[PDB]
Design an enzyme around this catalytic site. Structure first.
Site, PDB file in Angstrom:
ATOM      1  N   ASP C 730       0.802  -1.222   0.000  1.00  0.00           N
ATOM      2  CA  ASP C 730       0.000   0.000   0.000  1.00  0.00           C
ATOM      3  C   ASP C 730       0.836   1.273   0.000  1.00  0.00           C
ATOM      4  OD1 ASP C 730      -1.617  -2.131   0.541  1.00  0.00           O
ATOM      5  OD2 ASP C 730      -2.343  -1.390   2.476  1.00  0.00           O
ATOM      6  N   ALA C 731       2.162   1.180   0.030  1.00  0.00           N
ATOM      7  CA  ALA C 731       2.989   2.374   0.058  1.00  0.00           C
ATOM      8  C   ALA C 731       2.976   3.070  -1.300  1.00  0.00           C
ATOM      9  CB  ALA C 731       4.423   2.027   0.457  1.00  0.00           C
TER      10      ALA C 731
END
Ligand SMILES: [Zn+2]
Ligand SMILES: [Zn+2]
Ligand SMILES: [Zn+2]
Lengths: 65, 48, 1103
Positions: C730-731
């Site tokens: 999710d970065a």
DNA sequence: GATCATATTGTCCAGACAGT
DNA sequence: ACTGTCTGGACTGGTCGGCGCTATGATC
């Protein structure tokens, strides 16, 4: 609240031609052609000019000193 | 220890001593809210 | 004639939102409470009778003046919301109630005396901002786009979240599977008091009645006999006349035949309520309990007691039919049986409680004055006597405090909350917020889940996460809440229309029962004809739009329901007759031209408000081209079923429901120019985006809502690509040059307050730079930014623990103490502004607002509008970032793994639409179900010279070679959230400890530690690390040494003056040993000793 | 005016208990 | 010896941030 000086992607200056673009938009012309004649070809600079909304005029009315 | 202050509404300069103030307000328009003016000593801000 | 287009319906919806607004429920409820609610409460209380022979005081009309404030000197001046916020004052207006003394039965001259101050809702009819234009609001320091609808208590904005409660005075029936019984419950309301009256039927066929403050359920027949009916036949036809119902009643009174008179049942009730009491005391206690608890909504006089039995009968039938299959169990979560207590009703209840306590205080005051001075001073001037015996503040400090802590009388809590000021979306969401009385920890499978009656009333996606899921909802964009109307006029209209009264004709199987607000009023021969006539009259404008009529036509029972009360959430629907909608092109043209308004459209019956009860008889058509002859209504805007933050999501139908919920929830956490007057505001925490941008793919409702005028994010050139694993999990990866160019730049403002409080005996705080000779001196360099008046200069750079306001406090029980207000140790910035004013007590108040520049960095949370969120993984320089063949360098890079796992196609559609809008210059509509089609967007992208899929040929920024795959790059609206890494980093080595447990403090503001919870200890045990656990829990938290006596195990006492250690309980001056243990264990031993428990510590050698 | 004693007494699961 | 009923206890952890409250009717 004020138009950014440069495009966030490539640093192309857009604050000079923003007020002309806004004036031409309010005249009823197509903003795409206005951007085309102003040299704004890359859609990142077009993103910066189109998505920006002027709000400083509503902040100057509230004096802080 | 008196000092000058700026009014919130009228914006005119208001002079009073906070140490011995029986009541702090702007006598010009009756406003009870005052702003401390920014000092004229030069401040340096890094550009981004 | 054409079948209309969704654009015309959107224009109608825009006119509706322009006429009413988005905080209409709060404003209308407060206006109704102001107009008559105070008068209703005053009339309910009526008069006050003190201890004065042949004298009483009655209450007249009560009015409310303009919002004004009285200073410490005594000057009364008009009060404005900005002044109330800055000076920490409650925005309230005085309440003037005229008092008419009565002497010997002769009325005297009325006395108008202020009874307190009532808080004023923002932008209400009693507010100073009502009817003001944008320029007038600007001149008063108020944002023209501020919707109002909240309260300012002690300078803090307070919003009353609506409460989704059960319908008052309505019986709801359900069956308990575990108890194997049929149970019906009614929450009867009287003067803010709620009584839960229950009628149940167990497996034995007997009926029990549960009454509050009664410890055991007593038989239904006993209460039925004690309520006024003597003979068995009275109870026999007090319920119904159906033979099965009659036979059940015969069995009931045969089982309960041991009691035949009213006195025996009253004796039983009194004995159950108060056992071991004299018979007459139990009799009067039972009489009072029956009068004030058994259905209080029917009254308290014994005369209506018989009528209460009738209300019992309609309960018994409801219990009996479900026990016999005649009728089905109604849904508790159905919105026809659910009401919405707004701010007006809660304000009415709070004002009733405060006025009752004020009345009792005034009664005590007049009693004391008459007892002290006597009859001569009391009656020589009855105008001054009543006025002087009134303490208005006693009322006021009960009202605003309930609006300060959020605690309401009657056990209700959390009614008033702090208004969310993160951005424009959060405040609207909080003002349109609905909570539930159910506990958050309880698993409510049938209540938390979405209901079919929530269509057009409750947003289906915008719900919080965790325990608050389901129980906390938001009002839909088309949701309308009814306003109270006089029920007597509605009842008279129903009676004159042809409804036979209940007392005139008994209910029959062939007759349609008529219910008014849950109360049966009679029967009619043709229920369908009556319903049609009522609907036609409502469409003709003869009666108000608040009245809603529904018909339930089952094979067994037939009923007609008429609702005209508060708390009913309704939606507007276009009336369709014979397959043709009532809304024509002429009405749309009149709406566009301004000649026709929304209220005008409601007046002619073209569009009508439908609640959940009436909509059961309606057949709605989703689209104007799907209308048929059998259709009864046409949906105005299918996209209006979502809430205000949920409409921010572009193309929500192309995203997963949890993703839409996350995107709606995170829309309130974004940063932007929420308010134009943010610089003059004194909010304790605030955020500002340097260059906010309106999204290129935005729903048309956002223009009407006002999000375009107050944007809370920026459009990011996002390319979906794996880049060195720093966008993993999710970065996201951000461009260094973009950040340096001002993209997503934010400023964080924190406001500190300092008050020159005055203590007893004339001692008060002083605003000055503290002298180094006094104690508590933080340091010479900490006061370097202070002026000679003890106030920090504006535009001064500050750091952690830097002094802003120099304050000195008088010593406790020596030199003056130091109580200077300082910046947080983990926070810094530049002082933005300093405000000097006075509080309500006349004491000096200094508010310092300090701003800190928040350049985006690693750990800063950025979220898309489709629930895709993550922290910045790397600040990649522009030279290292890839670029397309068209010369576009992405401003953001996201991992391709997150797009298909979460089923987020709306993000890709938004990227395509943003690229198309940037290339063409025309904004792309992203409204739900009426937005620009995806295929059309791909078509114009192809016509613009780009690939249909949005993929572009990109070159690597490091190697310089062409990538073997065409990378999907487009413009996605990405918003920065307030969960910045600057305010979330905490690091404690050693510092302050708690005075009780000798353990590190709580939170980050006071340099607290990090909690090593029970789970951490468990996993440390599982790891087998004994010494690591000892170092963590004991050697680093509360390590201490104690003296223990070996003879008895008691804690020995060490005397420093004597210099000796000895056991006081035992003696033993020799056998004392030092034991190292936690201070928490010593506190536990002290608690055990205080609990009369003796712990004997049997000491053992270490080897 | 400045002080001062008193300030009220929601569900579900499991163990123990009258009733038949 | 069974059976329904009364009584008692617990309801994942952690973190960021805020708001607000913790006297008064006699007595000289
Ligand atoms: Zn550019
Ligand atoms: Zn002034
Ligand atoms: Zn001992």
């Amino acid at each position: 609240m004020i138009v950014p000086v440069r495009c966030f992607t490539c640093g192309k200056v857009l604050a000079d031609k923003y007020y002309e673009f806004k004036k031409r938009v309010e005249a009823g012309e197509d903003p795409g052609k206005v951007l085309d004649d102003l040299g704004v070809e890359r859609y990142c600079c077009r993103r910066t000019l189109l998505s920006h909304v002027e709000l400083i005029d509503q902040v100057m009315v509230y004096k802080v000193y | 220890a008196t000092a000058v202050y700026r009014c919130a509404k009228c914006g005119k300069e208001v002079e009073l001593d906070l140490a011995t103030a029986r009541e702090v307000r702007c006598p010009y328009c009756g406003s009870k809210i005052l702003y401390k003016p920014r000092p004229r000593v030069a401040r340096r801000v890094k550009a981004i | 004639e054409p079948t209309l287009t969704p654009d015309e319906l959107w224009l109608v919806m825009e006119s509706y939102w322009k006429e009413k607004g988005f905080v209409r429920q709060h404003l209308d409820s407060y206006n109704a409470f102001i107009d008559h609610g105070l008068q209703d409460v005053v009339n309910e209380f009526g008069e006050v009778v003190p201890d004065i022979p042949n004298f009483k005081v009655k209450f007249g009309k009560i009015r409310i003046g303009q919002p004004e404030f009285q200073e410490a000197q005594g000057q009364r001046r008009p009060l404005y919301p900005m002044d109330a916020r800055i000076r920490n004052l409650t925005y309230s207006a005085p309440l003037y109630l005229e008092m008419i003394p009565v002497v010997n039965g002769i009325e005297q001259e009325p006395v108008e005396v202020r009874i307190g101050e009532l808080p004023i809702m923002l932008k209400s009819k009693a507010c100073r901002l009502y009817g003001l234009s944008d320029e007038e609001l600007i001149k008063l320091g108020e944002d023209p786009k501020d919707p109002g609808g909240y309260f300012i208590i002690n300078g803090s904005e307070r919003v009353i979240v609506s409460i989704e409660d059960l319908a008052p005075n309505k019986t709801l029936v359900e069956r308990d599977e575990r108890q194997n019984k049929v149970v019906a419950k009614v929450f009867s309301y009287r003067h803010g008091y709620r009584a839960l009256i229950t009628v149940e039927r167990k497996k034995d066929g007997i009926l029990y009645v549960t009454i509050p403050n009664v410890p055991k359920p007593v038989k239904f027949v006993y209460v039925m006999r004690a309520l006024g009916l003597l003979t068995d036949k009275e109870i026999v036809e007090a319920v119904s006349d159906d033979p099965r119902i009659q036979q059940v009643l015969f069995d009931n009174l045969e089982d309960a035949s041991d009691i035949s008179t009213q006195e025996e049942a009253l004796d039983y009730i009194g004995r159950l309520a108060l056992p071991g009491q004299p018979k007459e005391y139990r009799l009067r206690r039972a009489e009072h309990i029956i009068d004030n608890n058994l259905l209080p909504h029917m009254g308290v006089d014994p005369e209506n007691r018989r009528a209460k039995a009738y209300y019992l009968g309609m309960m018994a039938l409801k219990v009996l039919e479900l026990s016999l299959g005649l009728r089905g169990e109604d849904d508790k979560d159905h919105y026809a049986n659910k009401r919405l207590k707004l701010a007006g009703d809660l304000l009415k209840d709070l004002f009733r409680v405060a006025f009752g306590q004020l009345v009792k205080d005034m009664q005590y005051q007049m009693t004391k004055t008459y007892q002290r001075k006597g009859e001569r001073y009391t009656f020589e001037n009855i105008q001054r006597f009543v006025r002087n015996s009134i303490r208005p503040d006693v009322l006021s400090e009960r009202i605003e405090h309930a609006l300060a802590t959020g605690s309401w009388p009657g056990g209700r809590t959390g009614v008033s909350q702090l208004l969310d000021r993160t951005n424009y979306m959060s405040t609207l969401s909080h003002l349109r917020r609905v909570t539930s009385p159910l506990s958050r920890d309880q698993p409510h499978f049938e209540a938390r889940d979405l209901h079919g009656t929530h269509w057009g009333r409750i947003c289906p996606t915008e719900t919080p996460e965790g325990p608050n899921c389901g129980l906390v909802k938001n009002l839909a964009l088309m949701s309308q809440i009814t306003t109270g109307i006089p029920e007597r006029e509605v009842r008279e209209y129903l009676m004159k229309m042809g409804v036979v009264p209940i007392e005139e004709r008994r209910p029959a199987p062939g007759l349609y029962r008529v219910y008014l607000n849950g109360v049966l009023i009679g029967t009619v021969e043709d229920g369908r004809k009556l319903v049609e006539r009522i609907r036609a009259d409502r469409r003709a404008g003869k009666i108000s739009d608040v009245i809603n009529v529904a018909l339930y036509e089952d094979e067994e029972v037939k009923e007609v329901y008429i609702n005209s009360d508060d708390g009913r959430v309704r939606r507007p629907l276009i009336v369709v007759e014979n397959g043709k909608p009532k809304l024509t092109r002429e009405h749309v043209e009149g709406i566009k031209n301004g000649t026709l308004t929304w209220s005008d459209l409601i007046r002619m019956g073209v569009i009508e408000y439908l609640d959940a009860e009436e909509e059961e008889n309606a057949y709605v058509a989703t689209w104007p081209w799907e209308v048929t002859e059998e259709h009864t209504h046409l949906e105005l805007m299918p996209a209006a079923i979502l809430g205000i933050p949920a409409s921010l999501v572009p193309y929500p139908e192309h995203n997963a429901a949890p993703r839409n919920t996350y995107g709606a929830g995170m829309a309130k956490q974004s940063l932007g120019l929420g308010w134009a007057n943010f610089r003059i505001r004194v909010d304790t925490r605030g955020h500002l985006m340097h260059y906010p941008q309106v999204p290129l793919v935005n729903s048309r409702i956002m223009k009407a809502v006002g999000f375009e005028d107050r944007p809370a994010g920026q459009n990011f050139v996002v390319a979906v690509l794996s880049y060195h694993g720093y966008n993993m999990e999710d970065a996201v990866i951000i461009n260094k040059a973009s950040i340096e160019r001002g993209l997503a730049r934010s400023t964080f403002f924190r406001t500190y307050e300092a008050e020159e409080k005055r203590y007893l005996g004339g001692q008060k705080d002083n605003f000055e730079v503290p002298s180094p000779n006094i104690q508590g001196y933080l340091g010479e360099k900490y006061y370097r930014h202070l002026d000679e008046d003890g106030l920090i200069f504006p535009e001064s750079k500050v750091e952690g623990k830097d002094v802003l306001v120099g304050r000195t406090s008088p010593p406790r029980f020596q030199g003056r103490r130091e109580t200077s207000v300082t910046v947080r140790p983990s926070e810094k910035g530049v002082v933005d502004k300093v405000i000097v004013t006075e509080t309500g007590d006349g004491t000096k108040l200094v508010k310092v607002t300090v701003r800190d520049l928040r350049i985006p960095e690693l750990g800063d949370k950025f979220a898309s509008r489709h629930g895709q969120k993550g922290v910045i993984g790397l600040i990649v320089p522009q030279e290292d970032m890839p670029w397309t063949e068209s010369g576009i360098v992405p401003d953001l890079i996201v991992n391709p793994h997150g797009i298909p796992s979460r089923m987020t196609v709306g993000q890709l559609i938004e990227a395509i639409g943003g690229k198309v809008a940037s290339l063409t210059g025309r904004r792309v509509d992203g409204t739900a179900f009426i937005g620009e089609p995806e295929e059309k967007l791909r078509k114009e992208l192809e016509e613009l010279g780009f690939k249909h899929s949005g993929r572009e040929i990109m070159y690597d920024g490091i190697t310089g070679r062409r990538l073997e795959a065409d990378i999907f790059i487009g413009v996605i609206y990405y918003q920065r959230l307030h969960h910045m890494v600057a305010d979330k980093m905490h690091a404690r080595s050693r510092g302050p400890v708690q005075v009780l447990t000798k353990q590190p403090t709580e939170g980050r503001a006071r340099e607290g530690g990090l909690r090593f919870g029970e789970m951490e200890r468990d996993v440390l045990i599982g790891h087998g690390a004994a010494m690591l656990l000892i170092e963590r829990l004991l050697e680093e938290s509360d390590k201490t040494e104690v003296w223990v006596c070996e003879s008895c195990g008691h804690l020995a006492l060490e005397d420093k003056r004597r210099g000796k250690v000895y056991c006081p309980v035992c003696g033993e001056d020799e056998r004392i040993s030092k034991v190292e243990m936690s201070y928490a264990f010593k506190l536990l031993l002290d608690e055990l000793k205080a609990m009369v428990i003796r712990p004997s510590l049997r000491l053992k050698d270490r080897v």
